[PDB]
């Protein structure tokens, strides 16, 4: 009658910022999303994914315009369908205890919509559009995108490398306050 072995819980504590008690609580959050899919005994080492539709509709994500990208970035195959490991990793990185450099790294991945290790004018267009639900005009969006590149494109190649992005964001006083999910 146990969800995990001692070794499995020790390993989750080792690779997340969660206590043993928190891993248990988050496991039940995960299992409750799809109780006919997720087994109650993980000592069997199951290979199970909760589908994206149930992840993105969770209270902690459902109102986030970037919810699909967040689940894609942390999911095993980039499609938003999540193993337990993926789910724990997502909330661990997004927790208040995660260091700023780790958060900046994953923020970069979230906003790199085309997954090319750069944030270009097209990635910026997607970000601004979602942030304003399409309520800015295409021309209005273009100005913003151009200004961000002017401000932040440090190596002057037309696009934001991770280094460009980290230089810009680690200065921002509200990055840690807003790039935070509590669960």
């Amino acid at each position: 009658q146990t969800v995990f072995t001692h070794e499995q819980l020790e390993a989750y504590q080792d690779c997340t910022f969660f206590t043993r008690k928190e891993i248990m609580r988050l496991f039940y959050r995960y299992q409750d999303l799809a109780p006919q899919l997720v087994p109650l005994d993980y000592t069997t080492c199951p290979d199970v994914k909760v589908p994206y539709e149930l992840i993105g509709s969770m209270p902690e994500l459902k109102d986030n315009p970037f919810r699909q990208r967040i689940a894609q970035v942390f999911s095993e195959d980039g499609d938003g369908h999540m193993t337990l490991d993926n789910f724990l990793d997502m909330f661990s990185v997004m927790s208040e205890m995660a260091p700023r450099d780790l958060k900046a790294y994953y923020a970069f991945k979230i906003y790199d919509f085309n997954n090319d290790d750069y944030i270009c004018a097209w990635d910026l267009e997607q970000t601004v559009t979602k942030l304003t639900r399409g309520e800015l005009s295409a021309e209005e969006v273009s100005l913003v995108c151009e200004k961000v590149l002017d401000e932040a494109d440090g190596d002057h190649d037309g696009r934001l490398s991770l280094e460009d992005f980290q230089n810009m964001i680690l200065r921002a006083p509200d990055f840690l306050s807003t790039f935070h999910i509590r669960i």
Binding site: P59, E60, K62, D63, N64, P65, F66, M94, A107, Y111, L124, T127, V128, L131, T132, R133, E135, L136, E140, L143, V144, K147, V148, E151, A152, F165, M168, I169, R171, A172, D174, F175, S177, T178, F179, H180, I181, R182
Partner: protein, 45 residues
Amino acid sequence: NTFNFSWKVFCSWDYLIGNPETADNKFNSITMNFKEAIIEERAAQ
């Protein structure tokens, strides 16, 4: 000053929001803030 629009694009959404009314208000706030900033930017131009 130097990251005015950058911080608007990457530090605007509050990932703690989990209510649709709160979310609606935030989208409106962000959108209006971009419009204000755009107005000032063209004036600077």
